[PDB]
A paper describes a structure:
The bacterial flagellar motor is a huge bidirectional rotary nanomachine that drives rotation of the flagellum for bacterial motility. The cytoplasmic C ring of the flagellar motor functions as the switch complex for the rotational direction switching from counterclockwise to clockwise. The basal body is made up of the LP ring, MS ring, C ring, rod and export apparatus. Here, we present two high-resolution cryo-electron microscopy structures of the C ring-containing flagellar basal body–hook complex from Salmonella Typhimurium, which are in the default counterclockwise state and in a constitutively active CheY mutant-induced clockwise state, respectively.
To obtain the C ring-containing basal body–hook complex in the CW state, we constructed the constitutively active double mutant D13K/Y106W of CheY (hereafter referred to as CheY**), which can mimic CheY-P to tightly bind to the C ring and lock the rotational direction of the motor in the CW state. The density maps of the LP ring, MS ring, rod, hook, and export apparatus in the CW state were locally reconstructed to the higher resolutions ranging from 2.8 Å to 3.8 Å. The MS ring is located on the inner membrane, houses the export apparatus and forms the assembly base for the C ring. Initial two-dimensional (2D) classification analyses of manually picked particles revealed that like the MS ring, the C ring adopts a 34-fold symmetric architecture. In the intact C ring-containing basal body–hook complexes, the MS ring is more stable and harbors much more clear densities for the outer RBM1 subring, outer RBM2 subring and putative inner RBM1 subring, which are made up of 11 RBM1, 11 RBM2 and 23 RBM1 domains of FliF, respectively. The more stable MS ring in the C ring-containing basal body–hook complexes indicates that the C ring is also important for the stability of the MS ring during motor assembly. Although the structures of the LP ring, MS ring, rod, hook, and export apparatus in the CW state are highly similar to those of these components in the CCW state, the protomers of the C ring in the CW state notably undergo inclination and compaction, suggesting that the binding of CheY** induces significant conformational changes of the C ring for rotational switching.
Author numbering:
A (entry chain A), B (entry chain h), C (entry chain g), D (entry chain B): 229 to 305, 353 to 439
The structure:
């Protein structure tokens, strides 16, 4: 029931990422000379979070006060000195409440496998690509897939001649 | 259901960013001599936040007072001196409450992949572009995509001859 | 639903900024010899704010009083002196409450990309523009776009010959 | 009843992982020259979790205070010294409540078995593949299956000639 809807959601996301990669990889490598497939680890767990933050007021310069009683006594007779300080302070503090409801269906970790073809010249020899072109393909695929390191995304692009 | 609506929202945003990039990249590079694709990491999490800020009043110059009782006693007989100061102060403080409801569907991180063609002169030789022109294309794409560093936007523009 | 309305709002704002830029850039550079595109980062977050400000009254010259009790005693017998001052003061303070509801749909950051053509004389040679003319175009575009530094606006105008 | 629905859910997930692997393994190894089967250990246990986190306030620099009473007495007569410090502090602490409902049907551990064929040249000799090609197949399968180490995923790809 709901599981099938989630699976179809994942399939559509993967297909659209695949198409976005293919769109940029087509003009330079050529139609059919590139194949990519995407798998997506998604987030279907309902989470609700409330965050409370208090600004520190331990420093007297940023401390906000409402009432303060400072009783000071010094009975000098060091000799028979007698110092007494009774201090009472009531503070008002900064407060920030944030309520967050995470979206259901977010992407947790995306791994993408891309395979490119060789280059057959007018003679027909399948000449492999170069390192610079491979790096360009890797960068383009990283851009298309929305590659990020916090998610833990992995990308692998290899070059090999396609079968007949 | 709602996930499909969010996905269509993302697709429309990406398509419009793509079209905006293409619009400026067309007059100089030429029709079809430029291809770009956009992916958008969006924000579909409902957040509500209330912020409270208190202006500090620790300095006597900016401190606002309502009532103040200052009892001072000095019984000089340092000898048998006896100083006593009882101070009570009630303050009124500046207060700023901000209530914020973040919009659903905002952009978190935008990464854009742009590929340009080579230059075929009247002879037909695919002459590659220059560094200055590449920098101009990068700047134009950054302007079109709304490039920002707080979001974490990444842009990659590479030059390569298009396939037939 | 609402997201589409917000997107159309952004598109209309961007189109009108584009048209305003084109309107002034047309008479001097010429029809079609200028192309500009605008992207707008907008504010669709409902914010409500209440601000309270108290005028400081720590200086006796600007302090407003309602009731004041000053008991002073000096029993001179420094010898066996005995000074005692009990002071109680009730103040009335200036107060300013400001309630603000920010508009939904305001502009946060505007970045604009403008491209101009070269100058083809009667012979037909595409002569590039000059530094003074480029500075004039930059100033005119800044004026049209409502360029501001608090927002974080970025503008890029480059000169390049248009393609056929 | 529900068990059959869960089993069909597992079968669909396994079939889609199998198809994703086959899709990338087809262009290079060839149609029919690759066979893969997937088994999935799934999560059909309803879990509900509430998490509470308190920011530490043991350091006076990050400690937020509401009321503080500090009575200090020093009766010097080390001699007949008498120090007494009575300190009472009321704190306000940061608080974060997270409520999480894990999705039913998540993947716990995925193990995948892939078998590839040999290479029969124009002569017909079944030449085995190379180490580099085997490593490429392993990497592609890891990418397709969403291989992860936290889950405990295991992958085994072996090379052997297919039977008639």
């Amino acid at each position: 029931d709901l599981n099938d809807a989630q699976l179809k959601f994942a399939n559509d996301v993967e297909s659209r990422i695949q198409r976005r990669i293919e769109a940029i990889l087509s003009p330079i490598v050529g139609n059919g000379n590139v194949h990519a497939q995407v798998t997506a680890q998604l987030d279907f767990a309902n989470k609700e979070q409330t965050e409370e933050h208090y600004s520190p007021n331990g420093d007297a310069s940023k401390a906000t006060l409402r009432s303060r009683q400072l009783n000071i006594s010094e009975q000098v007779g060091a000799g028979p000195r007698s110092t007494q300080r009774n201090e009472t302070s009531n503070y008002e503090v900064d407060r920030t409440i944030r309520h967050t409801k995470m979206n259901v269906g977010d992407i947790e970790r995306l791994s993408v496998a891309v395979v490119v073809n060789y280059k057959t010249l007018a003679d027909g020899k399948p000449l492999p690509l170069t390192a610079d072109q491979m790096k360009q393909i890797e960068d383009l695929t990283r851009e298309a897939m929305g590659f990020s390191d916090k998610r833990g995304d992995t990308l692998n692009v290899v070059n090999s001649p396609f079968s007949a």
